[model samples]
Target: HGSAFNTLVFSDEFEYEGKPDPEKWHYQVIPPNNGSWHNNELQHYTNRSENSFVSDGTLKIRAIKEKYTFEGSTKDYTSARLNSKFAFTYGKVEVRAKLPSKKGTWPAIWTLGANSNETGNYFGEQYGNAEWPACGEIDILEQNGWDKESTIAHFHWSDLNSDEYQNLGGTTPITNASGSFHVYSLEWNASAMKVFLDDTLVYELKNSQNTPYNAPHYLLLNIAMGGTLGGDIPENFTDDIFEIDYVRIYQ
Candidate 1:
């Protein structure tokens, strides 16, 4: 019989194996969006194998700044994205990783609802019922390359018929997130959510009547070059690294 405490699961520790795991992971090769999302964001997510790979027991997502054209659009950057296969309803999720510390880089460890696509909205198709924060997004860790020393946690959702999303969350300065390895954790339940840095609680979200964790969710890890949140890539941009030591899930 399954008990509430019996749901701990761990993904295979990523190895720099030159290729990604076909069964346990998949890539989201973003096609060109006509630069509408963010003019400064790099990468076309070309769905080509050349954009992604695994190496040395770690997942390496390289962002290259070079002119390229695809799907009737042109861009000056390319990079990779990776998503996990497993999904969970409520649990403690933790990731130990090192972030990229370069302007315009955005690396995140987050989760979206498992049933999002059938709901008919963009996030519903992307994540499901499509209402954000209401569907519940648990940002275990997010760092903009421009602000390498800080990590943030947020919970987003929408009220009935509202086009805009509302969220309540906070940031915790990790002084070393971009330079060294640290653990980011999310303790989530039907009642509330909490974020931690190396076992120290830094942020919390009390379960509201409108909270969204009533559904299941899956994990996502990616390093984006530039975006609405990441700001602009620097002219002196050198290659940066986002490293993962391990990922563990507990229910």
Candidate 2:
């Protein structure tokens, strides 16, 4: 069932120089967990251009070391998270991006089902029926703070007829991830899901009946700090940036 995808349905070329196009993206800054983010992250997400901006024909999600206060809560770091307004059931996604190498920085290019119950996202209010695992998560590219030489792809979903959540993933080695841009891609269909780093296939999984992989999903891009996967922040860290050249989807 892995047929070739042809039609272009969604994309962000990032040609404009400024804050991201408001018509295509929504900034996720509001903390959903009592003014704190999940995964024990230390950064406060903001809608400022300093955190997310377009320059030189690319989008930059910068993480900086600064004390920030929002709604009576304070944090010593700041970053940005963006959610795409577009959604699809099954397709292929391609993102050309460069990672951040500073210690304690976690950069992720991923997707969540539109029907997710996650608060402060683009589709939560309109389609907030299922929580995570039930809603499904597709991580196309994840670079941990402690490792810049590798990228990870993961899938999170609830197992049919089972109480435990299924977490399937694979790690692939790369070169100069922070120094240059590489294409990270995901090909999804009813039969299987495939992940690629540039042209190299890194992971694949077959879809099963009644799994959440068939639901409509939206994209997300962000950098987190000192979170569960991000590990400890370096004491002298000041700033770092994750850059995306473009994102395109075909089905």
Candidate 3:
């Protein structure tokens, strides 16, 4: 069977100013690994409007180099990690956004299966099926902090048949990625998943019985600093922004 994702089921045009709409987005500020996030990220996610806000008809998720304290823990950087309140089984999702350009700024637009056991997630408690690598992850866009010239589309899952963690992806060179807004998209269905950069197809994965793309997934938008992929934070780095013009989903 094929999918006809011609209907718009969810969207955020970022037309309003202030904090992100609560009804559609939830801030994932709690640190899951002790007091810090996974991937050795340097930023402490916050629900504050200072870290995530809407202005001039755009959603700005700012990663600021600052001394921030939260929940008895302190960090050198602050940012926002938003989890979409809505989740879907299969659909076409698109996000028009500009990448953050400074060194140590890692921006990602991704999805996690709602059945994940990741702590502090919106749907995890209710639908916790398996811990990740087992729950599956779909990364539409991941820009390395040290390399802004290229972006990657990656997938992670535990192969049901082999009982091994499978990591697969591809990279695409980008032109003026931080200076221009580009549409990053994922077309996901029962049999396949495709990732694209504007009009270029960057990566694709065909589904098998061992693959885990059949479950519902929720979106995540964030800018991390000085992590595994982010490398090191520039000593002079103060702040950088990941700007999103809009996000739309069709099914």
Candidate 4:
């Protein structure tokens, strides 16, 4: 009765006008207290309402530059990262949203195989495909504050029989993407993955037979502070916001 072409499998409009729905999302709190993970990022993700909320029918992932102590260390920045409790192997996903314009804001609408490499080992959980690069990661939408006109889409995995990291991805530029909200979509099946902006084809990746992408992946949304892709963050940067109208999945 349903197919990836039209039937909706999942969606979130953040219509509650308060904190995110606890039953549908899980807030990530990094353990071992590093304050950041990978890329030398500055924010310590927290479950605090100050970092994320639903307001006026929109989901907001907010970032702030303020001294805060998390875990065992002190961090000058705070933000939020959400992991969906659900996972799907293949389908279509679309997100309508606005990005942060600050030079250091890195916002992503992406998914990772429930079993991402070494992730569960430290997070106190286990995943079915947990070996990052080996588990596969799909970046449905990613924009660097420095590159507002374009969005990057890509997938990461390990090569067959080898531990070496392998990746296939590309970027497409659209005028004034950050000036307002735009639709970002991913159409994925068995042989390949395609990305689009405002319904116009932009980038595509051919799936390999041995890659882990044939498995299920969970959704993620977050606004990170300065990092590898975001370039340099300004000192006086005090606050910023990333807004999402909705996320719909078809399968």
Candidate 5:
């Protein structure tokens, strides 16, 4: 599918003074020390503005280092995770974002199948309720905690099997990845999935003839710290963030 679409299914410019539009998004609150997200992420997700907020026409997913207690649980860092209230089967998604600069930051723009029927399927899919990985995961953009200039696009899925970690992707080396806002996008249909950075093609892959890619998926954005990909966080580091100017999905 190309960027051209007669039907615009989702759009958010984040031009607001306070909290985000609740009709468009849902907060992802995963308690710390509760078998939360894998990769040993060091932050606890919250709905507070200290972690996520909309201001000056941008949606900010911020990460801060500090001892914070929420809902009776304390965490070393606090951040936000958001999942779209809407879902789409296939099309093009465009996001304008500025990466976060820090060794402990892991920022991402991704998607998950809406038919989440598994335990770790965080999309809150009410359909097949199939387990994650089987539900499919489309990572539109991801950057490790180590390098900001090296951005990656990826796909993760299997025949509904957790042990089968079938994944593949490549890096798009760009300069000043965290210095300014860049346009990133994904084009998907029945056969192929491709990604772009500032109109430059970065990742392209053919579907594995699997059932998951053909189904509906919802969007997600977050900033994590000191996880499997994010190697280490400096003790002196206090604040960091990933900012999104806008997100548009055309079908």
Candidate 6:
């Protein structure tokens, strides 16, 4: 179900401003969901520019452990969340990034539906409406500071009207995710979707005949702290950084 397609919608060689182009990139400030709503995720996302920036030909999403007040809330940590301005239905998305290594850090290069109105909200709304496994959520690259050497890929969707969804993915161990740059990519089409790390096929989601990726989706990059996948922020935890070399999209 794969065919040759050559339409470069966008590409960033990371030669210019490390900061995302305002005209092409959007930021989503995720408020603390009442103390770890999604997988016990810590770090309150701020709309302030200080929370996100670009420099040295890279996008730096910093996560710090300190108490700061915002939106009438006391946030002890801060991080950056950036998304692409353009959305695509079926295409190739590739990102080059260096993850942060800490006890409780979660960094990911993922995608979500561009229009969440169909489901009502953004991620969760779309997820619940279609019911995960059924609606389909793809995790191209997911890794943790705790498991500094491993990267994970997963697919989630609902089944039989059950709240709990089915997940199919595994992990690949890479010695130092924080020290070196690596390429993470997703090749999506009507039939199936595949994920790759440095050109190595890590996982594939098939049987998507009935449920195809028809909705437009935008890219997401973030470094999360002390939560479900990242575990609790340790007492000795300090500041950490997630560096993104570049992000490229093709259709």
lDDT string, candidate 5, 1-251, tens digits: 36455577899999887887998988877552453556888888778879888899999889999787666667798888888888898889999999999888999999988886434334544667666677788899999988877888988887543447688888888788887889889998887888888777778878655547888898989998888887799989888989899999987
| Residue pairs with backbone overlap in model 5 | 116-129, 117-129, 117-130, 118-130, 118-131
Instruction: List the candidates ranked by lDDT, beginning with the highest.
Output: 3, 2, 5, 4, 6, 1
Model 4 lDDT vs. the true structure? 0.78
Model 2 ranges with Cα > 4 A deviation = 1-3
Model 2's alpha-carbon lDDT is 0.90
Scored by lDDT, model 3 comes in at 0.90
The true-versus-predicted C-alpha distance at residue 42 of model 5, in Å, is: 0.4
> How many clashing residue pairs, candidate 6?
5
Q: In candidate 3, what are the lDDT values of residues 173-248, reduced to their tens digit?
A: 9999989999999999888899999888899999876777887899999998988989988899988999999999
Of candidates 4 and 1, the better by TM-score? 4
Relative to the true structure, candidate 4 reaches a TM of 0.91
lDDT of 1 by residue, 90-135 (tens): 7888788888777888878888776554221123354445644456
Which pairs clash (backbone N, Cα, C closer than 3 Å) in model 6? 132-157, 132-158, 133-157, 133-158, 134-158
* Candidate 6: Cα lDDT at 126: 40
Error of 6 at 53 (Å): 1.4
Give lDDT per model, in order: 0.68, 0.90, 0.90, 0.78, 0.82, 0.71
Pairs of residues at least 3 apart in sequence or in different chains that clash in candidate 3:
none
Query: Which ten-residue region of model 2 has the weakest summed lDDT?
Result: 124-133
Clashes of each: 19, 0, 0, 7, 5, 5
- Model 4: ten consecutive residues of lowest lDDT: 117-126
lDDT of 6 by residue, 1-251 (tens): 12344678877665665456777666666453543326667776654555667778887778888776655667678777777767678888888888888888888887765543222233445433443345556788988656788899877655443556577887787766889999888888876688888877789877444442566676777877877788877888767878888787777
Of 3 and 4, the candidate ranking higher by lDDT: 3
In candidate 1, stretches whose alpha carbon ends up further than 4 angstroms from where it belongs are 1-6, 31-40, 46-51, 118-134, 160-164
